[PDB]
Enzyme design. Sequence first.
Site, short mmCIF file in Angstrom:
data_model
loop_
_atom_site.label_atom_id
_atom_site.label_comp_id
_atom_site.label_asym_id
_atom_site.label_seq_id
_atom_site.Cartn_x
_atom_site.Cartn_y
_atom_site.Cartn_z
N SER A 67 0.82 -1.22 0.00
CA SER A 67 0.00 0.00 0.00
C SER A 67 0.86 1.28 0.00
O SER A 67 1.75 1.43 -0.84
CB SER A 67 -0.99 -0.05 1.18
N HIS A 71 -8.20 -4.67 -0.94
CA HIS A 71 -6.97 -4.03 -0.50
C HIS A 71 -6.65 -4.46 0.92
O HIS A 71 -7.54 -4.55 1.76
CB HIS A 71 -7.13 -2.50 -0.53
N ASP A 97 -10.14 -3.51 -5.32
CA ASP A 97 -9.24 -2.54 -4.69
C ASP A 97 -9.24 -1.28 -5.57
O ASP A 97 -9.04 -1.39 -6.79
CB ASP A 97 -7.82 -3.14 -4.69
#
Lengths: 283, 283
Positions: A130, A253, A223
Amino acid sequence: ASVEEIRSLFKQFSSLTPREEVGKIEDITIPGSETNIKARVYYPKTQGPYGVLVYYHGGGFVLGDIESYDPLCRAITNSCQCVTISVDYRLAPENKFPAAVVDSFDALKWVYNNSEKFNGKYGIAVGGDSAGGNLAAVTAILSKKENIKLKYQVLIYPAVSFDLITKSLYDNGEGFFLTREHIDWFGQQYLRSFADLLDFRFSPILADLNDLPPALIITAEHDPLRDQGEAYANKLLQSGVQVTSVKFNNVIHGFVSFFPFIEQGRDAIGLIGYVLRKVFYGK
Amino acid sequence: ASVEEIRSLFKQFSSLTPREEVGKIEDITIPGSETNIKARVYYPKTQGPYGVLVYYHGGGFVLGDIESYDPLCRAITNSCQCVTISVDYRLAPENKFPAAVVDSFDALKWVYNNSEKFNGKYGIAVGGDSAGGNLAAVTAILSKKENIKLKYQVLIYPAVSFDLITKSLYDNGEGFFLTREHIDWFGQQYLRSFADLLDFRFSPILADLNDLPPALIITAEHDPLRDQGEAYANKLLQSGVQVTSVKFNNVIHGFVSFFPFIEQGRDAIGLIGYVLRKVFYGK
């Protein structure tokens, strides 16, 4: 909940996740250009010499830390059979952009220059999830400029650009854990001003990606960041870098952090382990 | 080119691939219900006991064979550290549907009933690529029917349905190695009549998929079969079966066969290796 309360919750939730035994753990302090940077060094159970993975946790530049990411780093360490060094880079909003970048690069450089401490003779890779993936990607770009030769970069659903246009952002921007509202709020905490949107150190898609280390880029079907992650892979490929770009279907995600209960997460960790064992050891 | 020439062309080109060393190799002949079925048994370099992967080659039901797949099966063996048994099922057009299916299931039952011969204490999985992924899937469905308990199924860009409708068929039906004209021609060689389109042993998507073995399903971005592979994953998931479904971007149908040249294929082999080591060995 306050930012402090959420940071604490990340740590609390981590204590429910099993921590795999590894070979040895050490907490170190890396002398940064702007700060002394805590890091946790995990050794695998095999005998050296090793490759070294410098890992940057996710959390939108605001949340996460070495402790909340301890279970994941142990699992990666055992999967890659490599020394993993988890970096406690400075967080926003206390420390604005580019503090996280400065710490992430300073740590990498120090690891590269001190790899013998870890018996790291098989070389150095970066990886992160991320926002951490963002930092890994940016650190690899900065390394090229300083002739630091990395082996690999592992980018797990990375943030690579400011985005108001991708189809995944609109399809997946509500209802799947990481929302539009979150993304906006993190960006507000992290950045100093609108001008930072022009800075490759925030949006590494902007950079020239020639001559970067080969990559594994993992995206997730549900995501909002999915399309921009695949864009980064494509731009790497276009720039002559070898990239394995894999979309994991049926997951959201953050799924790699939930490996104890999302089996696809465990399998992504298996794939991460394979590529690093391949690049470091030949297998 | 006749069928014979098309076959020999594939063998030729496979003949030039370096074959990874494995532990040991034994050729066997399995007493089928309709024919004697040659299989090649690959042992890994580790010692047992083992899991056992029964593998069905691709080639549109018309080509491929033990020899032409020998490099891939070696690479798989070393990756999964598991006994791999590559099955020489009867080919079309000489042998029409359901000959391939009969042989594939006959081989599987025999392996399952003779697992001690391979020191196969950790159980039996099935796998295959393309047409062979079809055969693996159909074998798992038939095994469930006869209370044969399989550990896993590995489906590498499998064919799972007659298809005139998926978006990937139209988007990817020309220019990416496997074309509409090839799909048509293979089906014509293989099937007996239009009635066979109703038979789950040709289109396993038609079956009830409850209680089948957990799966890894790999699809490729530029593959006409991409969407129907994902559909099989989603139908398994809907039927309560655990599946890791991963789309490899930037590559075409057959990419795993090209692992010496296409690095994503090598990484796919790593993932297959990991999931089987996990399910057999806990590793």
